[PDB]
Amino acid sequence: GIQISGKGFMPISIIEGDQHIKVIAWLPGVNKEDIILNAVGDTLEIRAKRSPLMITESERIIYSEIPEEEEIYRTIKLPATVKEENASAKFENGVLSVILPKAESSIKKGINIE
Amino acid sequence: VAAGIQISGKGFMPISIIEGDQHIKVIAWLPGVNKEDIILNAVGDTLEIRAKRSPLMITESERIIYSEIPEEEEIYRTIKLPATVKEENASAKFENGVLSVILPKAESSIKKGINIE
Amino acid sequence: VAAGIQISGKGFMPISIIEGDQHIKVIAWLPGVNKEDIILNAVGDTLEIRAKRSPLMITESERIIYSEIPEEEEIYRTIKLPATVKEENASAKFENGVLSVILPKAESSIKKGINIE
Amino acid sequence: GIQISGKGFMPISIIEGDQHIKVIAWLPGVNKEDIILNAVGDTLEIRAKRSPLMITESERIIYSEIPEEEEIYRTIKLPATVKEENASAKFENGVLSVILPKAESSIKKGINIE
Amino acid sequence: GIQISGKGFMPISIIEGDQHIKVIAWLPGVNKEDIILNAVGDTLEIRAKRSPLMITESERIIYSEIPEEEEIYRTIKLPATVKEENASAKFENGVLSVILPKAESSIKKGINIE
Amino acid sequence: VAAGIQISGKGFMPISIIEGDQHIKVIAWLPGVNKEDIILNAVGDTLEIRAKRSPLMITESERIIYSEIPEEEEIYRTIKLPATVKEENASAKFENGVLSVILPKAESSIKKGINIE
Amino acid sequence: GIQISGKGFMPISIIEGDQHIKVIAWLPGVNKEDIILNAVGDTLEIRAKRSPLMITESERIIYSEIPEEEEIYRTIKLPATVKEENASAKFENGVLSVILPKAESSIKKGINIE
Structure with missing residues (x-):
């Protein structure tokens, strides 16, 4: 269960272990x-600024x-609670x-099958 | 200043062309x-850009x-440019x-100015 | 008795949830x-079900x-349940x-009845 | 050349040797x-009955x-004649x-290429 | 912030201390x-059954x-977490x-004004 | 002279059937x-045609x-024919x-002419 | 940058080295x-003639x-100048x-990345 909000171009992958x-x-x-x-x-926030192409006066x-x-930015809701520190x-x-x-509260523990 | 360009290739590769x-x-x-x-x-x-991008590397536990x-x-792009370049x-x-x-x-693609007598 | 549930995952895995x-x-x-x-x-x-299903195994003669x-x-499903469970x-x-x-x-998810004096 | 008829959920694969x-x-x-x-x-017939989920009175x-x-059932027309026994x-x-x-009458024999 | 669901006639008051x-x-x-x-x-649940008016054969x-x-019943979402026991x-x-x-986690503590 | 034929299979394999x-x-x-x-x-x-086609073989430099x-x-085709054949x-x-x-x-699929007395 | 013109059935692959x-x-x-x-x-030209199926009088x-x-034919514009000989x-x-x-005029030379 994930949720994504933000501005601009920023393709993203989320990997769960x-x-x-x-x-x-x-x-x-x-x-x-x-x-x-x-x-x-x-929740994870990624904020970035991208400097524009820098041309000379001769260049076009x-x-x-x-x-x-x-x-550009993304606010990303994650399927678990993380420990930021x-x-x-x-x-x-x-x-x-x-x-x-x-x-720890988000770390699933195993259930055995008989 | 849109000149005569042509683009062909495979995969994701955004491109800008700047002329001086x-x-x-x-x-x-x-x-x-x-x-x-x-x-x-x-x-x-003509300029060719060829690249290979390694896929995301996950463990067995990761998904x-x-x-x-x-x-x-x-991925690649073949790009026709509005001028002849010198590769070397x-x-x-x-x-x-x-x-x-x-x-x-x-040199045969650079504007040589012409002096007005 | 449709409670507050949420389902995420990959692949074919029909599911029923039964509350007592x-x-x-x-x-x-x-x-x-x-x-x-x-x-x-x-x-x-939250409950996680992860499985791998081996593909049909054919011989060289078989098609x-x-x-x-x-x-x-x-395949997998992550399932949000309407109560807190005790995993152990x-x-x-x-x-x-x-x-x-x-x-x-x-215990903090079980209905404790309240006695009417 | 195959043909499938029947009632209910029963995904099927057919493999020919x-x-x-x-x-x-x-x-x-x-x-x-x-x-x-x-x-x-x-022709092959598969007939099955699936017992419903069994809940208690407390359960819902x-x-x-x-x-x-x-x-549930499937009647399946096969591309060959089989020997049931x-x-x-x-x-x-x-x-x-x-x-x-x-x-035997459905077992193809090889033809050589010159 | 309260929420009320249920069946039948059951007027309700909620009092917060x-x-x-x-x-x-x-x-x-x-x-x-x-x-x-x-x-x-x-969440509080109130479930009740009310026996209908009991008439004789002569009575109508x-x-x-x-x-x-x-x-009849009401399920009532309360503005605090309670301790059922x-x-x-x-x-x-x-x-x-x-x-x-x-x-305790729902018991507000005072903030002093200067 | 379209007779009673039937075609099943996988992949690209154009076919003609000629009856004598x-x-x-x-x-x-x-x-x-x-x-x-x-x-x-x-x-x-019934006739079965089974084939495997090796893919285009490129070098590392080639693309x-x-x-x-x-x-x-x-690839394969199973083909129902309008007559019974003798495989051997x-x-x-x-x-x-x-x-x-x-x-x-x-022989039981060949037209034997009938002589008019 | 390729271009294809012609008549009839002739699937084609182009491979660049x-x-x-x-x-x-x-x-x-x-x-x-x-x-x-x-x-x-x-530019490459492929011209071919395909003899039709040859039946007898008895055959149909x-x-x-x-x-x-x-x-059948294809005229194929290629992304490079070739040397025909x-x-x-x-x-x-x-x-x-x-x-x-x-x-040689179509053979790209390498550019080093710093």
């Missing part, structure tokens, strides 16, 4: 220090499939990878 | 691609419950999943 | 699934000429491709 | 002794995706697997 | 032993404003009075 | 199929930029991706 | 000597999914395979 949730976000063209990343309860853009929206994140090749350890 | 007096710049989005998995070639008025992210492993002098950077190619125009 | 005063019973159809390939977990008001049977190898006391049977889970309600 | 036909049927919730299984010529059904149809069947995990040896 | 909630219900014509009364979390009803519905109830003159002590 | 007085000829298109990967069987009034050509690896006497050629099967009619 | 282009064409029922194959610049066609069009071709199992070496 037994004791953690992983969120993968595409942020090409974004600098690492321009990413704001926070979480509480079952003759073609562009690339979005110009400078400010223990989360971590990498940012390589324009991809953000957030690891959110599940709270 | 003496060069052309191509910008390509390649998130999730490693630098050494990019093949980059050019001749005449994907949601994904907006394309799974196509192999081209260069490229790859930062934050963005490839930036600089292609100097061939 | 002190327990909840979940019934799941898992034909073609081996018992040891079922993962079954719960906490709070499939007709099939209404789903080929999805990996749950139990389950698997007969004829049907999984039956019994989840005792947590 | 050189000397036999295999029929796979999903019968979750059905007891083995409540399956009737017969065949003649090119608040949700159900599970079909309540008590009696030699057929066999297993029933594991709610799946019925019928093996029907082909009659 | 700092440490308890009182529910008042009109149940004229109902015997005390035919009242079912339970609670959990923020020529006028009646009185509801004939034999079985400590609740109590009286039934006098056809009026049920339920006292539901609030759980 | 004493034989039936079946023509099947199997481009890209090797001869030894064709399985060919018959009994009564497919356009393809109208089906990728289905395994059948024959077949495979040239230029075309299979040609000759199936002599069983 | 660094120094060559491969064209694959389906020509079942065509004899090798009835294939005309030429090229210049960025009762069913046919097979196209009767006797003469160096091309080659095989014809096995009704499949034509043309190998067209790229001209």
